[PDB]
Amino acid sequence: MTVCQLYAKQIRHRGNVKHNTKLGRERLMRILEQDRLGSCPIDSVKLSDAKEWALRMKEKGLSYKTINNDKRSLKAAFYTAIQDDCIRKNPFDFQLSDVLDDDTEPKVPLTPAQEESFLSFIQGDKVYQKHYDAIVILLGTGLRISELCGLTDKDLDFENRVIIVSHQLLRNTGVGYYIDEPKTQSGVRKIPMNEEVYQAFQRVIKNRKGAKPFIIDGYANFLFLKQNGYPMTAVDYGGMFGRLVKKYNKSHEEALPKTTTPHAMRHTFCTRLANAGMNPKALQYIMGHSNITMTLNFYAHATFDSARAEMERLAA
Amino acid sequence: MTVCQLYAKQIRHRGNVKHNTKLGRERLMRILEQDRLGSCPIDSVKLSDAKEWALRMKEKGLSYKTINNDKRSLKAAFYTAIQDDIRKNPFDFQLSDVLDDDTEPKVPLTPAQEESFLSFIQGDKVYQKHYDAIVILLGTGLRISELCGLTDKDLDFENRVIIVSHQLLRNTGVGYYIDEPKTQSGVRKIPMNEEVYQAFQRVIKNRKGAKPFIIDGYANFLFLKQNGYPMTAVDYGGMFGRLVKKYNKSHEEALPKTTTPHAMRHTFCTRLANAGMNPKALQYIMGHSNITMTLNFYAHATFDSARAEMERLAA
DNA sequence: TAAAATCCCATATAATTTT
DNA sequence: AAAATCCCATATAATTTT
DNA sequence: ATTTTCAAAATTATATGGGATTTTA
DNA sequence: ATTTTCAAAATTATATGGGATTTTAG
């Protein structure tokens, strides 16, 4: 009767998932264990009670997107039960836009000189000077942080000047490092090298030092290593950025965008190209976007004037 | 507890549909009455039985898309049936794992044959009439019923703007009617080329002897059937067929058979997409509900295609 | 010279494609 | 020389990506 | 239509720890 | 995540009467 652990039924028979999926799955479970909704009988839950849940999540302090993803998880869990011959009527099929307001504070990319002031700061700052070449690469590839982390020496071709992104190196508490196919589950992609990331990649390998024995799922010779001599992870480069941009903020009047993270580097790269008139399907391949809709979100909303102005551009 | 009865049940509980839709529903309803499947009680329908049906639909002569769309119609009906009892859906499969897709390539007009086409139309006595409409179609990529539905109130020569707010349809029994978008997303505005603007200025002067006509507050339609009433998608299509035929007997090189009013639109979108027009903007002009459709006009990128794009821009 | 095939307009109807 | 502040490293929880 | 759109799977954000500098006493 | 994606809603193809336009055979 519970929804706390009749939700556990859904995830049990949908078992083959990534580790990071198991973590988020557990989060929702403990939310249900904390929330009143958890103990409610499965056939007792009405559409009103589901809406109130969302409100409680926002009062609890969770993000709009966070709650929204949770509605979908709960929508599917019960949706099974509706199809699973248990008492049927789904309370979680509504639009969260009616209940709550989307207060998702947008992520603003860096501007051509904003990033230049950043790079110039780093270039000569002995502490974070070392990470300069990694950052340049992020702005010239649009790699996910774990895809950069996962770059082994076999994944680079300096002849054709091309990066072969075929996997990523993930680490989570408990399992340590592990290997996954890219979140580009659509497949594999090659990313060419401009001259500057090329020069950056050369220096990285040359500056590689003190690499401890480390091979996982057949992958061995990584370029980007921690102080340990072990490869970098997401959280390592993340927290590294948090100190660096803070270091920047102290000496620079205008602060960097609120979420200037490795992830933002990828965002900037894409935004630059999309606003440069790159073929939307060309950019999709490069960004490893499984969905073309995702790639389009980096293109600006169109109006009659913009469309018309464009139409004359191609006319003459 | 019959496939026919079930489909009849489904389409009953969903009546808020336009005329063409209930036409398409009855067409499928006829199939269920005729095909072996329709008699089957939904208690005893299997994934096997569904895939058999599709195989019969292929041998019948029906295209993949017809079968696939009808599959989805029937798939929907079973979704209704699971809730009120039925545990699983017989039509929850992929037609591609049952049927191969022979759907013919809809090829755009090469600028040379497009050029040769217009001069031909401009040339011969019988078809110089519709030169203006055809040029307008090509230079604006309007859907044929959006064209037929155009009136003087929908034009803006004072700023060269075409307001698509509606479409004039015509049907058997029903007659003429107009369908409007509930959302304001359906309204879209198209710029006028000097070619297009002038072409529309030469159709006003030639609109002759119009029969008295107003439908849902829409009157003075620009486009000209010789019986005094506005022309129709069917009335345009038939003419196109005759037009192309006389062209192809005159010309050795030409011309694609899929040539049709919507081929003008398909051509419009292709030449624009290839020339590098912003996808968001191109979606606006085309009036696509889904943005993915616009991108079907963009040839998928290879690593080589990705190679070129960046070597240009990334500097 | 009148005579027969066939282009043409229109439309009911069934199948295909857009999105 | 003592005490903050920083760098690097984690475990845990929430948010963004697709 | 097809594809996750009936959430998976990544990322950032936050809390805690010494040891190394940096900075005040 | 929403968007139709458990088809709606368009357009094109096929077939057939009338009526003008030029065909092949008197």
Residue numbers in the entry:
A (entry chain B): 82 to 397
B (entry chain A): 82 to 166, 168 to 397
Kindly provide excerpts from the paper associated with this entry.
Concerning the nucleophile tyrosine, Int contains two tyrosine residues located near the active site: Y379 at the end of αL points toward the scissile phosphate, and Y380 in the subsequent loop that threads away from the active site sits in a snug pocket on the interface of the two protein subunits. To explore the two tyrosines’ roles in DNA cleavage and recombination, we generated single and double point mutants of Int82N, substituting one or both with phenylalanine that cannot cleave DNA. Both single mutants cleaved DNA in vitro, whereas the double mutant was completely inactive. In agreement, in vivo assays in E.coli showed that Y380 is critical for Tn1549 excision, whereas Y379 is dismissible (Lambertsen et al., 2018).
The DNA cleavage and joining reactions required for CTn transposition are carried out by a transposase enzyme called integrase (Int). Most known CTns, including the Tn916-like family, have Y-transposases that use a conserved tyrosine residue to attack a phosphorous atom in the DNA backbone. Int contains 3 functional domains: an arm-binding domain (AB), a core DNA binding domain (CB), and a catalytic domain (CAT).
